[PDB]
Amino acid sequence: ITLTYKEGAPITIMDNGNIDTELLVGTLTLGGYKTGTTSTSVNFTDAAGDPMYLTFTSQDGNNHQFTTKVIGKDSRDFDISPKVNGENLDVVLATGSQDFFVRSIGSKGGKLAAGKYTDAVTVTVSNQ
C-alpha cells in the first residue's frame, strides 16, 4: 500500500477569518490495493480523530484548525466516500490506484491565521 499527497492551491482566508467550503485542499493518492477493494475498506485517520474529517493545524503554536472531508470520484464522476476516522457520512476503487480529494469544510472555531497547516495522516486498508 502506497499513500502520497499533493497540496492544492493556496487557501484564501476570508475577512471574517473563516475559509470557503468545497475548496480542493490537496489530493491523496492511494495505491497497491487488491483487485476489487472498495471504499468501505479504506480508512483515513489522523490525530484529531474526528469521525468523517481530517483536521489541519497551524504551526504557530496557537493551534488554529480547520476540518476537511475526503471524497473521490468514480468513472461517472460520482462521489467515492472512504472512511475517515471510521465513518463516512460503498463503491469499487479504480484499478491500481485511486485519487481522493481533500475538500474544505471550515474553521474549527475562531479566525484562522495565514501560514502553513498540516495533518499527519494514516490510511488503513482492510480485506487485503
Binding site: 493556496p10 504557530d60 491565521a113
Partner: protein
Amino acid sequence: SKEYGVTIGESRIIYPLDAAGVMVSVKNTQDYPVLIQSRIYDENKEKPFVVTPPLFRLDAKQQNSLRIAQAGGVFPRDKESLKWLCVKGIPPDVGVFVQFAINNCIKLLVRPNELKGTPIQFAENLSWKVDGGKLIAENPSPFYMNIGELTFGGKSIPSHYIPPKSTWAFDLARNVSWRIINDQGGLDRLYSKNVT
C-alpha cells in the same frame, strides 16, 4: 456616499531571486468597472521588475491576474531586497466634488535561493535596546522582519519592518513583545525580551 475597494490576492510577494516570474491576483470588489494600474517602486517609494499588464480594465466584481517578472538586474545574495507593488484602482455657494482612488501597495520581497529557512525561524532573534530616546530593534537575520504587532512596557508601538542585518528605531519599561508577519501574511507567534 461613494464606495471604493481593491483587493490583492496576497499581502506580500516572496519573489525567488532570478525566477522567471510569479502570478498575483487582483480583484475589483466594486459595482463599477475600473482601470487597474500596477507600479513597482524601490524601497524608498521612487520610480527591474515588470508587471504585466501595467494597465488594464477590470469589470465589476471581477478578478484577474498580474505577472511580475524579474527583468535581469542584480541583487545581493546574503539578504533579501525590498520593492513595493502598488495596485491602483481608477474609477470611471461652494459646490464640492471629490473623487477617490485606492492605491493598494504590498511588499515585494526579493529572496535569494541562497538564504535558508523563512522569517518565522528567526523571529525570536531580534534584540532590543533604548538609545537616543527611541526603541531600537536589531535584526541579525538576512530576512526582512515585518513586525505586525509590537508592545513595549505594555504600550502599543506602531509597527514597521526591521531590515535584514540592520536595525530600525521606533519613536517612544524593559519588556518588548513582538509578532512578525509570516510569508503568507499571518500574525506569527509572540516573543518577548527585555531591552539591554
